[PDB]
Amino acid sequence: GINSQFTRSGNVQGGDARASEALTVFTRLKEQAVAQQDLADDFSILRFDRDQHQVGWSSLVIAKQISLNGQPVIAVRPLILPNNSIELPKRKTNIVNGMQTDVIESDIDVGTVFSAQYFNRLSTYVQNTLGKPGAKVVLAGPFPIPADLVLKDSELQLRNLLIKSVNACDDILALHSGERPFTIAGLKGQQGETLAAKVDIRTQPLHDTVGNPIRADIVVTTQRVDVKLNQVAMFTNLERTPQAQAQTLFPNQPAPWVASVVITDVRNADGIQANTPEMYWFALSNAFRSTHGHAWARPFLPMTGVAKDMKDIGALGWMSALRNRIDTKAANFDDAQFGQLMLSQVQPNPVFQIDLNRMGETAQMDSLQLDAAGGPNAQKAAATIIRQINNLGGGGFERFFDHTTQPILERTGQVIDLGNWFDGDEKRDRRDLDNLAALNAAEGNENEFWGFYGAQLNPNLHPDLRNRQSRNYDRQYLGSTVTYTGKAERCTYNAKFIEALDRYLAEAGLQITMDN
Amino acid sequence: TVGNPIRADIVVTTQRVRRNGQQENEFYETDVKLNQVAMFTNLERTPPAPWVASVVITDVRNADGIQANTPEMYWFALSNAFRSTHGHAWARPFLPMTGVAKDMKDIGALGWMSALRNRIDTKAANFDDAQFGQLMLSQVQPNPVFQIDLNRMGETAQMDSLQLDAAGGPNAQKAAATIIRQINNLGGGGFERFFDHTTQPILERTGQVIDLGNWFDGDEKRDRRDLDNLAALNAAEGNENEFWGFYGAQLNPNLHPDLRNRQSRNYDRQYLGSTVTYTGKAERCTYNAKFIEALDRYLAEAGLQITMDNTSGQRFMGNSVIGNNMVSGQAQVH
Amino acid sequence: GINSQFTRSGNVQGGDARASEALTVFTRLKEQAVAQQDLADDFSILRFDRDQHQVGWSSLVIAKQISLNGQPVIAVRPLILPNNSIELPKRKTNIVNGMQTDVIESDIDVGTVFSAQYFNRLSTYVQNTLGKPGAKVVLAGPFPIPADLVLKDSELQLRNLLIKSVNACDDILALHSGERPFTIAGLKGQQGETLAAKVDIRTQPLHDTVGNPIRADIVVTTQRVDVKLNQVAMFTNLERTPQAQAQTLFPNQPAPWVASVVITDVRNADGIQANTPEMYWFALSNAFRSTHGHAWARPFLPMTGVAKDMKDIGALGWMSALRNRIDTKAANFDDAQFGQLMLSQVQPNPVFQIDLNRMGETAQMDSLQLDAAGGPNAQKAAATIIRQINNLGGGGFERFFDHTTQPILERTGQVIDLGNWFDGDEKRDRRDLDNLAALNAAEGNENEFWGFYGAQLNPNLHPDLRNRQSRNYDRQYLGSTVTYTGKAERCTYNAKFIEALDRYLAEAGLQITMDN
């Protein structure tokens, strides 16, 4: 280089600030926890400087270091530490318009940093540090640390994150060890303590293990008889089919909207500690129950005296045979008239989809879902998912349908970015923009709403341009204080998949009763 | 280096680009930044387009990767600073950004000084990119003059003293000789041919005694340079005899500079928060119009492959070239 | 191929229809003309079948076959015969929009067919036919035969075309022989028969030697004292500078339009026979005189009781501080108020430009003008043009200005296609669309007029797309019966060029008086 050309008698800056603080606080928390017998000291925490290995983001790893069957095996869980001080170079793409060309520069998320080369470098680093070059390396699901967090004032959440990380490492190591899978037959016993569902509606968002908010309008949960089993949090979105609008301009001698349910959080119970595929599917089975009594339409019911311009059903007036916002806030806000309005505005059957996260708290399990919907490793993922479902059920799940005949889920080629925004006192998830809220904010102006919808969905537009337009529209609404954390891909389950999974669970034993 | 802030909204960064296939380093910044220059845009006025654009170079420090501060780095940074008139990049900060109404930076203030006494609905939907590109051709001359704030007690004070002396004084000739020697000791292509020093001066002081302070709002600090002419126009609205009063307090020949400095301090206390504090004093100067062009031509002929991109809805607006040939005057044949 | 694969006992079609008829009628006309002593029989007419030499359009040549200085030299004038029966393959271009790409297919004109390979093939064909391989080949300017013409009913015009073709061949052969150039001093003599100009306004278009109409609103002509010298036909067009509209939306404490004069026909007198560069420049010198008394504004003066919606000045009302079409057809149509309107709507100084034709009746001379404005052969063209002007004048024309210092003319990167359309009884030139007529037809609708103007002029659009949009807008207006013949490039002279040419002619002798 040129710094060594002159050999000046001075060294400025270090190039690493947050990693040292994180290592110190993590060592302090580990020592405090092991002092009072909270965690076994068998596991170790390491450090991975970004400069010393030519990597984008410095991420510290958690390792268990337990062998198996006489051969060495290592299980590692990453923990990325993005830093605002260091800004890695952006990504440039070229778009041709007319005769001219333009360059769009887009920021680099945390998902794109965790490349295969990064995994290989971390694997070789941990192999060299732990002195077992022949060990087998597995991952329990990398999880970023949000940059807004302050290290000196995050005791409880950091301790909980460490505990969950070591639990996940132990769980993946045990799964490689091949324990006994938990079938539904274990739940049922001599006592007639049948399971139950207490679906509930929420307004304030749920919180991650760190503090990142995630939007959740309806939650479905499983109880015994004190004891909880599952909790699936998800909200409702509306989409417009091209044929419905066609039957509005050019009529002919259905409904103008379709209802979509987006699963966001699929975590198991707080009380339970282990995390296994059978837990994941037993929890996901509850994501279909919300359709009982059309309960998924509960958020669309008018709020108790609260305007909430991001959830006004009057936007349906802007897109209908009639015009103007519907004055639902009058004395005619009764639940019955809302019932006929829903009967004649949206179809009575929903569609299920999930914003699968490549770097969520269950990113290891979401990765299987992404591979099951496309890419080179597709058939093997289908075999794994079907065999996991069979192990859960214990019966002939292949009879209900064949994986090779119909796809498990479709990719749909959409990207949803996760973030948070500040309003009033409590922050909310970025994913509150939706389409109904955008239509309410636009208060008409067909062109603006159609442009926003195209910005979210356009097969003929470059993905980077679509992301930039979505970011611009996000900044336009709900203020200009949005902060982005990660990226997720939205994929829709096939109807037959759930329609057979719930039936198979019922055949194999489903002792749940709900009232609505 | 210290916690003092510097007003800077346009940063021109020059760095090396690896063309070895981009391998064994995915999304790794390494250390490729050569040097950066930080500058803003100021709008002066004349007694065509009335408003004349001006670019004031504020920060000239080189990248943290290098640890040696030599004159050649300084002149490389000055050469870099010129690479902003390409694509009218100096007009980018004047472009409104959707979603923010922070004020005291909007372009609509020029409307107060136009034929009509109104502010253009800048944030509205009717103000698009094509309309903005009109407001510019209609209003500001499309050639930016180059200024620079020499700091007597700044980071590059031992180097800024050379230009301050070359502005004119007892050591002006020696300063010109040494600055010519320094710039020629960068490429060795004979700077005498491209641009001499005895023929015309290199930089002229404008007489402004602009000074560096600090003012706090919104739970952060910022530099006192944020109050330019456009900010004063926005803050004081379309009223007259107070914007011209501010411009005169900024500079007038027919009064002692102490009174105008006191008036400028009073105005700074008035428009922005009274919590402002003052740190040091600088001196504004204007570079020669063709000296920078000669420097850029030198750097080009010596050999520096520098690549640009981007640059500035798209419906057609006039030929812009037919006006060249007017063939004024008939034959007047008897 | 596959036709010879089966060797069927049948041969269908010939692939050439119009060439045989043209050869027969041309032989008949040549024999009739030479019978009564009209043309010397030294020249010969040939035939060039399109199939026998792998060429696009079959073109018949006219050759003189006269040697010079003891070495053989041949002068040939082509004559292209486009046929509607045979449609040559189109030209495909690709335009990228967003992520998608589209292909635009454009027709092939007559200008693009006459490639250098075509010239070489014709040269070798005439060398082989005439038995002089070492002869030097020169061209007198190829000229197409319009497809709408019927061969059996075109006696007079075809005979005149043949006579003009042989005259042009003789003229180019003589110019290569190096005769005495005709300076202005030859015109002046003992008699005080000073030259004069009788600029006149026209409505019906002038006609070519075949019948193709060319728009001509003002003509400037040179007379003696029965005897005519020159006739330059040209019309007026209006263009909008970007600064004028800027001073309308965003004002500040000139004129909204600029006047352009487009020279179309630069032919010499009908009576005179020779065609030489001195004739061309002596005629072009008259193209500046029209500015006397602002006479070029005469077409803008309201017509005598005729609406003529393609020439209404009321379009200026649509583009002004006021609104709506100006009711000029009222009792306030006096010439004075039109004078103040012109004083305050357009600048009092015009700009000159010419729609140079690569395949016009003077295409050989227009080619020099195209090379003078760009391309590789640029400086040599400037030397030739300046030396021709000097030979015309006989004095130091280099003193007035230097060609190497300022360009003679600018290309401007515009293409104007020539054609004709049918209305009422008499057809008119395609070039009547203009901009003022388009604005009148649009009767407002800022977007439509701006889109049309951009379709004519857009540096950021592909030339093929611009041509297609211009064709579509042409078909939209003035009916859907437009027929295209050739393509021309519009180039604007520099002001100094004419401002010095007229002055140099005045210094060298300019005895012309006009009254207006």
Residue numbers in the entry:
A (entry chain B), C (entry chain E): 49 to 273, 287 to 314, 320 to 582
B (entry chain C): 257 to 303, 320 to 584, 589 to 610
The authors write:
Here we report the cryo-EM structure and biochemistry characterization of gp105, a protein that is encoded by the jumbo phage 201φ2-1 and is involved in the formation of the nucleus-like compartment in phage 201φ2-1 infected Pseudomonas chlororaphis. Previous studies using mass spectrometry analysis identified the phage-encoded gene product 105 (gp105) as the major component of the nucleus-like shell. Gp105 has 631 amino acids and shares sequence homology with other NLS proteins (Chaikeeratisak et al., 2017a,b).
The four molecules at the interface of two head-to-tail tetramers sit on a 2-fold axis, interact with each other through one distal end of the molecule and form a concave tetramer. Given that some of the concave tetramers can have a stable conformation, we performed locally focused classifications and refinements on the concave tetramers with C2 symmetry imposed. Through several rounds of classifications and refinements, we finally obtained a reconstruction of the concave tetramer at a resolution of 4.09 Å. The structure of gp105 is composed of N- and C- two domains. The C-terminal domain (CTD) contains a twisted β sheet core of 7 antiparallel β strands that is sandwiched by 10 α helices. Interactions between molecule A and the two neighboring molecules B and B’ are mediated mainly by loop 303–320 (molecule A), loop 273–287 (molecule B’), the N-terminal segment (residues 49–61, molecule A), and the C-terminal fragment (residues 589–610, molecule B). The C-terminal segment (CTS: residues 589–610) of molecule B is inserted into a groove of the CTD from molecule A. Hydrophobic residues, including F592, M593, V597, V603, A607, and V609, are involved in the interactions between molecule A and the CTS of molecule B. The interaction mediated by the CTS, the loop 303–320, and loop 137–155 are unique and only exist in between the molecules of the concave tetramers. In the high-resolution concave tetramer structure we obtained, the angle between the planes calculated with the subunits AB’ and A’B, respectively, is approximately 85.5 degrees, and the distance between the gravity centers of the subunits AB’ and A’B is approximately 58.9 Å.
